[PDB]
C-alpha cells in the first residue's frame with residue numbers, strides 16, 4: 001500500500017486473481033487494527049472485520065481506506081474460501097507513516113550564476129511529510145533526446161545548490177524529486193521541468 | 208446578551224448595508240463610545256465608518272461589499288459587535304450574490320424561433336435557489352428611456368447537457384421590444400437581474416448561401432466565383448468570400464466586397480493549374496446581426512486556359 | 519520500541535496536526551489568545567505543565583471535536599487519539615500511572631452554544647487547539663514530570 005502526499009487515505013491492491021491459475025473461489029480482505037505499532041513478534045489475530053472492496057479493469061483489486069490512523073499498526077491477509085473449506089494467506093504489517101510517498105517539490109527555478117559561470121537550482125520543500133527529507137537533481141541539454149547526469153543532496157536546510165557545467169550558452173532543463181532521509185518511504189514524482197534563459201555571463205575573453 | 212438588527216441581510220454586489228448592535232455586560236450597558244466592530248474575527252473594521260447614534264446604540268455601514276467566498280459548509284459572513292476586551296458568540300449573517308448574468312440570442316433565419324440561454328455553473332455564490340426568467344413585449348423599440356417596468360409574467364425552460372440553460376420561444380414579432388431578466392429567491396429574501404433588451408430585427412443571422420460555384424475564366428486568367436443571395440432576410444448586406452489552394456491544409460486569404468448588387472467577382476490566381484477551394488460567408492451591411500455559418504466547399508476542374516507561350 | 523522513536527514520533531505528529539490545522543480556510547489569522555464571553559469551557563489560555571492536565575485538555579478537545587461532523591475534523595480526531603495513546607506510552611515510560619480520563623461534565627453545556635452559533639465555535643476551537651499544540655511542542659522538550 002501507498003499513502004498520498006496529503007496523508008488522507010491509504011490505497012492498495014492484491015495481485016493473485018489473474019497471475020495465479022486456480023480460479024472459482026470467493027476472496028475477501030480482512031484487517032485488524034492496534035493502537036500502537038504492530039508487534040515485531042509474529043501472530044495471527046483471531047478477531048477480524050471484513051472489508052469488501054471492488055476490482056479494477058487491469059485485474060488488480062484496488063480499494064481504499066478513507067479515514068486513516070497515522071501511527072496505528074495494520075494487519076491484513078487474503079482469505080480464499082473454497083467449497084470444501086477455507087484458508088488464510090500469510091499476514092503482514094503495514095504502517096501508514098513508513099509508507100507515504102511525498103508530493104513533488106514545487107517552484108523549481110534554474111538560472112546561470114553571473115561572473116561565476118555555474119548553474120544554481122532552487123527548490124521548495126513540500127508541505128508533507130514533516131520529517132527531514134533528501135533530494136535528487138537531474139539536468140541535461142535540451143533536445144529531442146536528453147542526456148541525464150544526476151547529483152545527490154543529503155541535507156535538510158539546504159534550499160539551493162550550485163554545480164558546474166561544461167558549456168554556458170546552451171539552454172538547460174532541471175527536475176527534482178524528494179524522498180525521506182531515513183529510508184522508509186517511496187520516491188516522489190518528477191516536478192514540472194524548469195527552463196533557463198541565455199544571459200551575458202561574462203565579458204568576452206578575446207576580440 | 209447581544210441583540211442584532213437586522214439579523215439577516217441579502218443584497219447585491221456593490222450595495223450599501225448598515226448594521227446595529229447593543230452590548231451589555233455584568234448587568235450594565237457599555238457606552239457606544241467604546242464599541243468596535245470585528246469582521247470574520249480576522250480583521251478589525253476601521254473606525255472611519257463607525258458612527259454614534261445614542262449612548263447605548265452604535266451603528267456601522269459597509270461600502271461596496273465584495274463577493275463572499277464559499278468557506279466549507281458555511282456560505283455566509285459574520286459581523287461582530289465587540290468591546291475592546293471580549294466578543295460575544297452571537298453574530299449577524301450577511302449574504303451577498305452577483306446579479307450580472309449575460310443574455311443574448313439571435314432571430315433564426317426561419318423568423319419563427321428565437322432561442323437563447325443563461326448559465327450559472329460558473330457562479331458559485333448561489334446554491335439551492337430556484338431560478339426563473341421574466342420578459343415583456345409591449346414596446347415597438349427598446350432603449351427609448353429607462354423605466355421602472357413593474358409589469359412582468361413568468362416563463363419556463365429546461366436544462367441541457369451543458370450548464371447553459373437554453374430556452375425556446377414561440378412565434379415572435381420581428382419589430383417589437385423584448386426586455387428580459389432573471390430573478391433570484393432565497394430563504395432570506397429575493398433579488399433580480401439588471402434589465403436589458405434585444406431587438407429581433409437587428410439580430411438576424413442569414414442562412415448560408417447556396418449554389419456557390421467557382422471556375423477560372425477562359426482566355427482571361429481571372430478566377431470568377433458565383434453565388435446566390437440568401438433568401439432571408441431582405442436587408443442590404445455585405446459578402447465575405449474566403450478561398451485558397453485546395454489541400455489537406457490550405458493557405459487561406461481574405462477579400463471582402465461592400466456592394467450587395469454585385470453577384471460575382473474576378474481575381475487572378477498565382478497558380479494557373481491547381482485545385483482551388485472557395486467559401487462564402489454573409490453578414491449585415493449595417494453591422495447589426497451575426498455572421499453566417501460557412502457554406503459548403505466548392506471546387507473546380509483543371510483544364511487549359513490559354514495557348515502555351517514556349518514550345 | 520526504543521523510547522527515542524516515541525519521543526520523535528510525538529513531535530512529528532504534533533507538527534503534522536499543526537500543519538493540518540493551518541490549512542483550514544477559516545482559521546488563517548484569527549489569533550490564539552482571543553477572549554470570548556460565552557466560550558469559556560474550551561481549554562486554553564493559561565498554560566499547563568503536568569501530564570494529568572495534558573490528558574484532560576486532550577480529552578476535552580477530542581470530545582468537542584466529536585460533535586462536529588465536518589470532513590476535516592474526523593481526521594484531526596483520529597490523529598488526536600494516536601497522540602493520546604503516545605502520551606500514555608510516554609507516561610508509562612516515566613514510571614508513573616495515568617488514568618484514562620473520562621468525559622468532562624462541563625461539555626454538556628455545549629448543546630445550546632452549538633445551536634446558537636457554529637462559526638465562532640469552529641474558529642475558537644481550531645485556534646485554541648493549534649495554540650495548545652504549539653505549547654505542547656515547546657513544553658515537551660523540557661520533559662516534565664507526571
Ligand SMILES: *[C@@H]1O[C@H](CO[C@@H]2O[C@@H](C)[C@@H](O)[C@@H](O)[C@@H]2O)[C@@H](O[C@@H]2O[C@H](CO)[C@@H](O[C@@H]3O[C@H](CO)[C@@H](O)[C@H](O)[C@@H]3O)[C@H](O)[C@H]2NC(C)=O)[C@H](O)[C@H]1NC(C)=O
Nearest residue numbers: 218219220221222223224225255256257268269270271272
Ligand atoms: C454608498 O454610499 C455612498 C455615500 O458616500 C460614501 O461615504 C462617504 C463617507 C465616502 O466614504 C464616499 O467615498 C462613499 O462613497 C454613495 O455615494 C457616493 O458618495 C461619494 C461621496 O464622496 C461620491 O464621491 C463623489 O464623486 C465625485 C465624482 O466622481 C468625486 O469627484 C468626489 O470624490 C465625490 O466625493 C460617489 O460618487 C458616490 N457614489 C458611489 C458609487 O460611490 C454610494 O453611491 C452608495 N453606493 C450604492 C448606493 O451602491
Ligand SMILES: *[C@@H]1O[C@H](CO)[C@@H](O)[C@H](O)[C@H]1NC(C)=O
Nearest residue numbers: 026027028079081082083086
Ligand atoms: C465462505 O463460503 C461459505 C459457503 O458455505 C460461507 O458460508 C461463508 O460465509 C464464506 N465466507 C466468507 C465469504 O468470508
Ligand SMILES: *[C@@H]1O[C@H](CO)[C@@H](O)[C@H](O)[C@H]1NC(C)=O
Nearest residue numbers: 004005101102103104188189
Ligand atoms: C506518481 O505517478 C504515479 C503513476 O504511476 C501515480 O500513481 C502516483 O500517485 C504519482 N505520485 C503522486 C505523489 O501523485
Ligand SMILES: *[C@@H]1O[C@H](CO)[C@@H](O)[C@H](O)[C@H]1NC(C)=O
Nearest residue numbers: 221246269270271272273274
Ligand atoms: C474588494 O476586493 C478588491 C480586490 O482586491 C479590493 O481592492 C477591495 O478593497 C475589496 N473591498 C472590500 C470592501 O473588501
Ligand SMILES: *[C@@H]1O[C@H](CO)[C@@H](O)[C@H](O)[C@H]1NC(C)=O
Nearest residue numbers: 337339391392393394396397
Ligand atoms: C421563489 O420565488 C417565488 C416567486 O417566483 C416565491 O413565491 C418563493 O417564495 C421563492 N422561494 C423562496 C423565497 O424560498
Ligand SMILES: *[C@@H]1O[C@H](CO)[C@@H](O)[C@H](O)[C@H]1NC(C)=O
Nearest residue numbers: 413414415416499500501502
Ligand atoms: C451552422 O453551424 C451551426 C453550428 O455548427 C449549426 O447549429 C447550424 O445548423 C449550421 N447551419 C447550417 C448548416 O446551415
